[PDB]
Amino acid sequence: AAKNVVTQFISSLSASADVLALSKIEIKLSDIPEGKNVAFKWRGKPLFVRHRTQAEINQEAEVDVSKLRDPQHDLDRVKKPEWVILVGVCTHLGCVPIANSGDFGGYYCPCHGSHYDASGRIRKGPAPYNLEVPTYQFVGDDLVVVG
Amino acid sequence: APNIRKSHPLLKMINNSLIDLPAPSNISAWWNFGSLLAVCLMTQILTGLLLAMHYTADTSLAFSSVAHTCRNVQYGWLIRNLHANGASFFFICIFLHIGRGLYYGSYLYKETWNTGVILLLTLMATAFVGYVLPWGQMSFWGATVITNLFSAIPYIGHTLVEWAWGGFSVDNPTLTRFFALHFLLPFAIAGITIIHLTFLHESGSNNPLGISSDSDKIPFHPYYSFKDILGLTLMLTPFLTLALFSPNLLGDPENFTPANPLVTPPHIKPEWYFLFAYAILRSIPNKLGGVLALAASVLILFLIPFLHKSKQRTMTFRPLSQTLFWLLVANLLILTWIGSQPVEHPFIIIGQMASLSYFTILLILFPTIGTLENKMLNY
Amino acid sequence: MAPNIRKSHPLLKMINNSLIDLPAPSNISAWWNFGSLLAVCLMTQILTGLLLAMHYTADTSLAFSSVAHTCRNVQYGWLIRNLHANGASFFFICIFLHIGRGLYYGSYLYKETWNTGVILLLTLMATAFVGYVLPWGQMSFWGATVITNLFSAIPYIGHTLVEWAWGGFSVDNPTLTRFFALHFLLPFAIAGITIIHLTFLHESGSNNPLGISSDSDKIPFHPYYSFKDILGLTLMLTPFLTLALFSPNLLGDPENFTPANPLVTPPHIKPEWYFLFAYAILRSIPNKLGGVLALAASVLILFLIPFLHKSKQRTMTFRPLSQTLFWLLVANLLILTWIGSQPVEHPFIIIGQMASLSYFTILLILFPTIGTLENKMLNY
Amino acid sequence: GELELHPPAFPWSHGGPLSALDHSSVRRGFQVYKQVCSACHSMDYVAFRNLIGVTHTEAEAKALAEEVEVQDGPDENGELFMRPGKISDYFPKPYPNPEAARAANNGALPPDLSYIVNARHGGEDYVFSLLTGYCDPPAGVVVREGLHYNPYFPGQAIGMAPPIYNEILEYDDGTPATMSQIAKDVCTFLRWAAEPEHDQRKRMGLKMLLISALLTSLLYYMKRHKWSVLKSRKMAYRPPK
Amino acid sequence: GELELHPPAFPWSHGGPLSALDHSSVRRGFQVYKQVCSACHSMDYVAFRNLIGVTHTEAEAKALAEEVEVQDGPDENGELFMRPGKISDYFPKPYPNPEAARAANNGALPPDLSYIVNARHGGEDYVFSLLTGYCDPPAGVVVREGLHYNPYFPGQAIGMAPPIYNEILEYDDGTPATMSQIAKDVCTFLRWAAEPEHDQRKRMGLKMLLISALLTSLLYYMKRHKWSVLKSRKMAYRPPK
Amino acid sequence: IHFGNLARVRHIITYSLSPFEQRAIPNIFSDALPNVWRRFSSQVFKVAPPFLGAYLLYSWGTQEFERLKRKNPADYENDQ
C-alpha cells in the first residue's frame, strides 16, 4: 500500500498529460522542398528543418573541421544529408536566427552577428557553439519525429 | 541516563507522549479519534500541498486549474478526491471526538477542552475558505451568502465585510486572500494541536468509568499504538470506499458549474458538516439574531465546562443524562436534515423547534437533570 | 500548585524559562544579538510574505503583473513589497554575522544547536531561491534555469530529478506554481526548526566571549537582554529602512524589471549578493559535475566545523594566530562575493580559483593546523 | 413553477462499483456528439488525444483532429491564421463567446458538456430521460414561443428543440440508430467526458477493498494478540486482614 | 567589443533623498510621451486616473482618456466594439502584439516604458544620455542599414532613430522646447511612471529617520540605565585566609 | 530550574547600586573613550591587514580588467 501511494504522489509531480502531449513533434519531410528552410514550434522554441540540396551538402564537406570553435563535420550533426534539423536558438544569448542570409548562406542572428553555415555552425560572430541539434529520427520517407 | 530514549532532548519528548506515556488501561474506541484527527490533519496538509502545486488563485483560472489537475496531473483526480473527501472524514472524526468528551466529561480538563474548541473553529474556517477555491457555483454563492451576514453587525457592519472581500463583492481579491488563508490555517491547526496535547498531558487521559486510573495504567506502546493503527484502517476503509466508489456522493452538483454572479442557484446550502448550523441560522428570521444564533451554535461549547452539576464525571452511571445525551444527538441529525431543506412549511417550524431545543438541552436540561440525579443518589 | 503563576502554568512556564527567568551569561556581547534579530526577521518575512501572497497570482501570464498591480494599486503594496524583498537581505546579513560569531567563539561545540543551525541556513537559502522566482522577471527565470540545470549533471538520475522538479521540460508554469507552494511552506519549516534550535541551545545555555564557564556570573534574560536585544533591533532596523526607503533598488538587478523571456538570455546571469560567494565557487571548477559538488560543499562544509576543532580553548579571543586566519577567511569571502558578480574572464577566473581554493584550505587544513600549533605555544 | 418529475434509474453497464464503461458505446456516443451535439455544445475539457486508447486509434484520433481548422498565431506580422488540428487541440467551440451562442439559440445558452452529467442531479439518467422525454404540454399549460415542452426539464419549458430522432445519423459500426440507442450511447460518452478516470478509479477500488480486507483482519489479530495479556489478566485483593 | 560608455550623473531635482519630483516637469514629460513616444512605446502599467492629483486635474484626466477609443465587448451578439476612454483605462498600446511592433520598426522591438528607468542601469541618466547622445560612428565602425549610431547604447547600433529634436512639439505651459529640455522632462516623467510612490516613499523616509533618531537614543539610555547596575558593580574575594 | 544549581561559589562579595542612584553613561572622557581607543588599537593590526590586502587585489583586478579592454597600438603599426 505505502509503495503505491508514495509512487502516485511522487508521480503527480512529474509532467502532466498536457505537457507530455507537447513532448515531441512529428514533421512531414514531404512538406519541405530542397533549397527551402522551414521552422516549426517545438517546446516553445523555434525548430529548424531545412531540405539541403545535393549542392549545399557539398559546400558542407568543404569545411575545415579544425577551423571552427565547435569542431564538428556534417557527419556528426545530421543523419540524412538532405536533412538538417536544428534548434532555432543562437548559442550566444538566445535569439532566433534568420535563414538563407548571412556570410555563409546559412543563418544569421541579428542580435550580435553570429553567422551560421548551411549546417548551422558558428562561423563569424560572438556565439560560442553551433545551433543545437535535438534528438529525433525518421519514420517512412516523409515523416520525422523530433523530441 | 541509561537509555537514550530518556536522555536525548528530542526523543525524550517522543517517548513521554507516544511510548512510555501512561494511559488508562480501560479507554475504549471513543479514544481513537484524537489520533485519527492527527493523522487526518497530516493527510489533508499533504494532499493539500500536492494540489496547491497545480492550483491558480484567479477567478479566470481557478475552476479550470482544478479541472486541469483532475484531468492531466498524474493521479490528480485521486489527490483531489482524497483531499475533498478527507475534509468530511476530518469532520466525522471531530464530531465523534467532541461527542465522546461531552459524554465522558472530558471537558473538565478545561484547557484541553478550550484549545479543542479553538481547533474546531479553526478547522471550520479552513474548510470554509478551502471550499471557495474551486470557484464553482456553490463556492461563490456560499461565500456570498455567509460573508454578507456580517454586514448586519451594527456600525462596523459593511466596513468589516468590504474589508474582508477586498472590494464590493466576492471577487478575485477575495479568492486570492482565501487561498492564502486556506494554506495558512492548517498550520495554525497543527500548532494549536501541539498545545492541545500539552495541556492534555498535564492530567493524562480520562477514562470511560470516570474514576482515577492511576491504579491501572499501561504504556501507550504497544497497546494504544496498535489499537490506534487498527482504528485507523477500520475508519480508512469506509473513507476510501466512498472516495473511490462514490466520489461525488457528498458533493453538490452545482459546483461543477463555474461561478456566475448573475445566476443564483435555487438551493444555496453548505456541506453536510455545516448543515446543522445553517439550520440554526435560518431559524431566527432577523439578520442580526440569526448571525448571533449561528455563532452561538458553536461558541456554546465554551460553556459546557461551567454547566457540569453531576457529582460523577461521565454519564456511564447516569441513565437520565444518557437519554438526554442521545436526544441531543438526534436533535443534531434533525437540524442537519432541516438545513438541507428549503425554507418552507413544515421545515420552518420544525427548524425553530430543533434550534430551540438544541440550546435548551445544553443550557437548561443538562445542568438540571444532573442536579436531579445527584439527589437520586442521596447526595 | 506553586506561588507565582509564571512557573506553574504549562505555557507561561515555557515563556518564562526562555525569555524571562532564563539564565544568561553576564558578559555576552553584541554578537549575541543576532539570534533574536533572526527570529524577529523571520516573523517579519512571514508577515509581509502573507500580505503579498494575498495579491499574488502564480501563473506565468500573471505573476509579473500581479506583483506590479500589488505595488501600483494595493494600499502600501509598494512598501510591503519593498520590506519583504529587502527583508531577505537583512535576514542574510544577520545570518552571516550569526554564523561568524559562532565560528569565532566556538559555539559550534554545541553540536546539535550548530547542526540545526546549518539546517536553518539551508532552508533559508531554498526559501529565498524559490521566492526570487515568483515575480517572474528576467533574472527570476534565468537564475532558475541556470541553477536547476546544474543537477542534470548528476550521474544517471540527473535529467530525471531535474525534469521532475520542473514538472516538464524547462522552467515553465508548472515550476512557478510549485515554487510558490514551496515558498509559502518552507518559512513555516524554518519557524519549526528554529524552536528545535533554541531547545537544544537551552540544554547548555549560551556560550560567552571568553569561552569559560559563566555559571559563576549569570543574569536573567529580562531585563538585561530583553532591553539589549530591543536596542539591537532598532540599531539594525535603521540601516534596513534607510535602504528600503531611500534606495529601494540598490541591491536588485535591473534585469528583473523585464518580464521573463525564454528567448533572450541576459548578458550577466548572477545572483543576489548573498549567493555570489557560492556562485563564484561554482564557476571556479570548470566541469559541470565538479562545480555542482563544489557549490554544494561551499555550504555543507559547515557540518564539518565541529570536527575540526583542535584548540584547547573554546574561542579565538586568546588565540592571535587563529584570529588573523579568521579575518583572512572573512576577507576571502568578500573576494568570492566580488568574483561572483564579475564576468567569467581573466583576471577574475584565476583570482576566482585562488579564493575558492583558499576558502576550503583555511577551513579544512589551516584552522585545525594553526589550532594545534597554538596548543604547543601554550606549552600544552 | 413547482412540481418536478424525477428520472428513473436505468441499468447502465457502468453503474456497478466494479463495472467499467462499455468503450464500444462510448465510441458511438462520441460520434453522436461530434455529428449532432457539437453543433451547439462545447466540450472545452476534452482533447482528441484523450480518445486514443479509449475509443480510438492514434491514427483515427489524428485524422479526427485534422478535420478541424484551429486558429493559431500570431505569425511574423502579428497576424492570426488557420491551421489543421493536432491531437493536442481540444474539441472546437461552436461559438466565440456565450453572447454569440445565445444569439444563435434564441437567447438560450447551450452549456459546455464536459461535466454535464455531474452538473445535474440524476446524471446520465437525467440527460437520457430529457432527450427521450419530449412531449406535448398538459392541459392548462402554455409554452412560450421558442421553447419546447419537456416534463423532465425544470419549469418544463426548455430552449433546446428535440436534438435526436431515429436514423438522425448512422453508426459506422453497424448499430441500429434508434433514438433511444443514440441517447443511451451519447450519455455513456458524457459520463466518460466527465471523468476519464472512471475505469481506473474502479480498478483501484477493487485493489483497495482486497488489501483493506486483508490488512484489517491481520491488524485485528495483532491488536488482539497484544491485548490478550490484559484481556485474560486476573487479579486478587489479599490484605493482611 | 566589451567597451561601453557610461552616462554621467545629472543633478535631477528628485535625486536628493528628501527631494520629491518636480510635478511641473512630470506634466511636461507626459506630453512628450503622449505626443512622441506613445507612437511606438507602450506604457501598460499607467492609467489616466493615475495622473489625477499628480500632474493633471480630474477634468483634464477625463478629457485625455476620452481622446482614445478602446475596444470593449462582447455586446449582445458577442461582438467587439469601440468606445471612448474612461480614466480607468490604461495608456493605449501602439501595436496588438510584439510581432506587429517589430514588423513596424524593422524587426526591432520598442519596449514598454513603464519600468524602463529601472530596467536599465543608469536609469534616467542613461535614458537622457541616450536620447541626446546620437552622433556619427567613429572611424572603422560601420552601422548596418536600419540601425543608428548611439555611443550610449550597448553595441552602439540602436534600432531607434533619434526620437526628439528642437521644437518637435510645443509645451502648452510655455516652456522653450529645446531637445535637451524635452529629454529632461520625459525622463522625469519616466521616473514617475516607474514609481508613483516616489514622493510618498521619501516623505516616509523623513519620518522614519526622525523617529529612528529619537527612539534609538531613548532605548540607548534605557539599556544603559538598566545595565548601570552591572557596569559599576564591584566585587572582592574574601577567603577566611 | 536553572538558578541555584549552577556553580559552587565561595567567599565572593559584590556591591551594587540601584540604577537611580547612578549615571547611565558615566565618565565618557576619562574612561569610555580612552577604552574605545584602547580596544580599537589592540585589534586594528589583526583585522585591517587582510581587508587591506583584499582591497588591493580588488583594485588590481579591476584595473587589470579595464586595461585588457583598451587597444594595444602595437597591433596596427604596420597595417598601412
Ligand code: HEC
Ligand atoms: C441547436 C443546438 C443544440 C443541439 C444540436 C443540442 N442542444 Fe442541447 N441544448 C441546446 C440549448 C439551446 C440548450 C439550452 C436549454 C435551456 O437552458 O433552456 C441545451 C441544453 C442542453 C442540456 C440540458 C440543460 C439543463 O439545464 O438541464 C443538455 C444536457 C443538452 N442540451 C444535451 C444535448 C445533447 C446530448 C445533444 C446532442 C444529442 C444536444 N444537447 C444537442 C441546444 C442544442
Ligand code: HEC
Ligand atoms: C518610431 C518608434 C519610436 C519612437 C517614436 C521612440 N522610440 Fe524609443 N525605441 C524605438 C525602438 C525601435 C527601439 C528599439 C531599439 C533597439 O532595441 O535596437 C526603442 C528603444 C527605446 C529605449 C532603449 C532601449 C534599450 O534597450 O536601452 C528607450 C529607453 C526608448 N526607446 C525611449 C524612447 C523615448 C523616451 C521616446 C520618446 C522621446 C522614444 N523612445 C520614442 C522606437 C521608438
Ligand code: HEM
Ligand atoms: C484538529 C482537532 C483535534 C486534534 C488533532 C485533537 C487531538 C486529540 C488527541 C490526540 C487527544 C488524545 C486521544 C483522545 O482522547 O482522543 C485529544 C484529547 C482530547 N481532546 Fe482533542 N483534538 C482535536 C479537537 C478537539 C476538540 C474540538 C475538542 C472539544 C471541543 C477536544 C477535546 C479534547 C479533550 C477534552 C480531550 C481529552 C480526552 C479524554 O477525556 O481523555 N479535542 N484530542
Ligand code: HEM
Ligand atoms: C485542515 C486541513 C484542510 C481542510 C479542512 C481542507 C479543506 C478543503 C476543502 C473543503 C476544499 C474544497 C474541496 C472541493 O474541491 O470540493 C479544499 C480545497 C483545496 N485545498 Fe484544502 N484543506 C485543508 C488543507 C489544505 C492545505 C494545507 C493546502 C495546501 C497548502 C490546501 C490546498 C487546497 C487546494 C489547492 C484546494 C483547491 C483545489 C480543490 O478544490 O481540490 N488545503 N480544501
Ligand code: HEM
Ligand atoms: C533562521 C535562523 C536562525 C535562528 C532564528 C537562530 C536563532 C538563534 C537564537 C535566538 C540563539 C540565541 C541568541 C544568540 O546566541 O544569538 C541562537 C544561538 C545559536 N545559533 Fe542560531 N539561529 C539561526 C541560525 C543559525 C545558524 C545558521 C547557525 C550556524 C550554522 C546557528 C548556530 C547557533 C549556535 C551554535 C548558537 C549558540 C550561540 C552561543 O555561542 O551562545 N544558528 N540562534
Ligand code: HEM
Ligand atoms: C524565510 C522568509 C522568506 C524569505 C527569505 C523570502 C524571500 C523572498 C524573496 C527573496 C522574494 C523575491 C523578492 C523580490 O521580489 O525581489 C520573495 C517573494 C515573495 N514572497 Fe517571500 N520570503 C519569505 C517568506 C514568505 C512567506 C511566508 C510568504 C507568504 C506565504 C511569502 C510570499 C512571497 C510572495 C507573494 C512573493 C512574490 C511577490 C514579490 O516578488 O514581492 N514570502 N520572498
Ligand SMILES: CO/C=C(/C(=O)OC)c1ccccc1Oc1cc(Oc2ccccc2C#N)ncn1
Ligand atoms: C464558502 O462557502 C463554503 C460552504 C461550505 O459548506 O464549505 C465547506 C457553504 C456553502 C453553501 C452555503 C453556506 C456555506 O458556508 C457555511 C458556513 C458556516 O459557518 C459556520 C459554521 C458554524 C458556526 C458559525 C459559522 C459561521 N459563520 N455554516 C454553514 N454554511
Ligand SMILES: CO/C=C(/C(=O)OC)c1ccccc1Oc1cc(Oc2ccccc2C#N)ncn1
Ligand atoms: C531562481 O534564482 C534565484 C537566484 C537568487 O539569487 O535568489 C535569491 C539566482 C539568480 C541568478 C543566478 C543564480 C541564482 O541562484 C543561485 C542559487 C544558489 O544556490 C546555492 C547556494 C549555496 C550552496 C548551493 C546552492 C545550490 N544549488 N547559489 C547561487 N545562485
Ligand SMILES: CCCCCCCCO[C@@H]1O[C@H](CO)[C@@H](O)[C@H](O)[C@H]1O
Ligand atoms: C487501505 C490501503 C489501501 C491501499 C490500496 C492500494 C491500491 C492502489 O493500487 C493502484 O491501482 C491502480 C489501478 O490498477 C494502478 O494504476 C496504480 O499504480 C496502483 O498503485
Ligand SMILES: CCCCCCCCO[C@@H]1O[C@H](CO)[C@@H](O)[C@H](O)[C@H]1O
Ligand atoms: C523605527 C520606527 C519607524 C516608524 C516610522 C513611522 C512613520 C510612518 O509614517 C507614514 O508616513 C506616510 C507619509 O506621510 C503616511 O502616508 C503614512 O500613513 C504614515 O503611517
Ligand code: FES
Ligand atoms: S544572441 Fe545571437 S549573436 Fe548574440
